[PDB]
From a paper:
Pgbs are single-domain archaeal heme proteins that are related to the N-terminal domain of globin-coupled sensors (GCSs). In addition to the typical 3-on-3 helical fold found in many globins, the heme group in MaPgb* is completely buried in the protein matrix by a 20-residue N-terminal loop followed by an extra Z-helix and some inter-helical loops with a previously characterized functional role. Thus, the heme is only accessible through two orthogonal tunnels located at the B/G and B/E interfaces (named tunnel 1 and tunnel 2, respectively). Although MaPgb* assembles into a homodimer in solution, this structure does not result in cooperative CO binding.
Numbering used by the authors:
A (entry chain B), B (entry chain A): 5 to 195
Amino acid sequence: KIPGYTYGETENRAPFNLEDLKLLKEAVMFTAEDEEYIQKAGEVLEDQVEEILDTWYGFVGSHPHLLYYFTSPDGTPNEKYLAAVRKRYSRWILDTSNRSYDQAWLDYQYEIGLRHHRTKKNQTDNVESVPNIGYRYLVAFIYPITATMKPFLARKGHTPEEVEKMYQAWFKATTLQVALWSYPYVKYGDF
Amino acid sequence: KIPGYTYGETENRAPFNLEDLKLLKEAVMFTAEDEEYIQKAGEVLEDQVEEILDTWYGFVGSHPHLLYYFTSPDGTPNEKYLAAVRKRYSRWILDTSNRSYDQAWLDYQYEIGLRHHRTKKNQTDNVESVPNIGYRYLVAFIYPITATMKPFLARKGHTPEEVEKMYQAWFKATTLQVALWSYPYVKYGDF
Ligand code: HEM
Ligand code: HEM
Ligand SMILES: [C-]#N
Ligand SMILES: [C-]#N
């Protein structure tokens, strides 16, 4: 249903395993409590995805140096690229909320990292665009991901403490993912 | 003074400049509005630093794979190392809140990244310890840094809205810094 989306059918095994993941979850203070609240976050976000996507890509589109990563050689946004990625980002919202964080999840996290990185960027959609997303901005984007989700998490009449727990779970899960996605960017042996 | 603390006295110019910083601030949604609240955060945190340090190093100390980065080759924690770093971390709380984010600030950011990385780790305190802090944990630590600061930000009686603004400012500034500290870890040209 979703072009380019290959969760559970990636070509590579991730260079990290469930033991690595356990230790990283501990570093981001992610526990069974957050598994519960990330699932609840999904329930709240699921029917708000179109507005989330508009808010997220609105932010990206608001800064030329960010929109840059979706541009054709002529400096204009590649609309085919944007539209195809948007469908996979929509799915990532659900995957973050609903998937077991097992080896298949890890294998896809590695894949997503490879796709932001020069290793695989522009291959999934067969587009001509910029070769690499500078790592500085991947880390940076942990923040706007959280700031984007925050208002939507409060829109279904949950208690502010329930919202805070969903927001913190999202923050933890996003940090965890970007940590994993960093692998292809990091000098070998330094990850 | 503070042994090893060389803010404004670094040997190298950072590989990033104020134009890089402007673009990265935009990526973390940091504006003039956050400058106000990061300064306020400093006013709130300053006389609570001992408790903050105890909480932070309490978290690190409670996980063998994190405390690991302060250990001597025989696996035992190096208490001299811990104590010396603690003094510099205490200063970093104030610098984040009080310094102009100019080229001197950027130069020290580069230096802090080099000190977590194998490039300079263990040199400042002339200790023998683990050669490198795996980058996965630098990213991960954005979360617990923010989680550690949050309760302290509310202890001076500011409104929930002001506390939230201080917290969000701290989150942005932490993410911004970790993005810069990634430089020595990232494959050359991919940052
Ligand atoms: C917290 C940080 C980020 C998150 C959570 C995120 C999320 C995602 C997701 C879910 C996908 C689709 C993955 C798939 O193929 O299944 C994707 C791809 C993509 N993202 Fe991001 N992203 C982040 C950082 C960034 C940044 C900084 C940029 C720069 C504008 C960016 C631009 C893109 C582009 C251009 C693609 C397509 C890559 C390709 O050619 O395959 N992303 N992102
Ligand atoms: C958001 C992430 C982090 C922040 C804000 C932070 C903060 C700091 C600060 C302010 C310093 C002193 C810098 C100076 O010399 O002036 C430092 C050094 C140090 N930190 Fe971190 N840190 C982070 C990640 C980590 C992680 C994941 C570890 C692993 C336990 C760690 C362990 C250490 C060690 C061992 C040093 C001494 C390095 C050296 O030999 O010079 N830090 N950190
Ligand atoms: C990424 N969007
Ligand atoms: C780092 N402490």
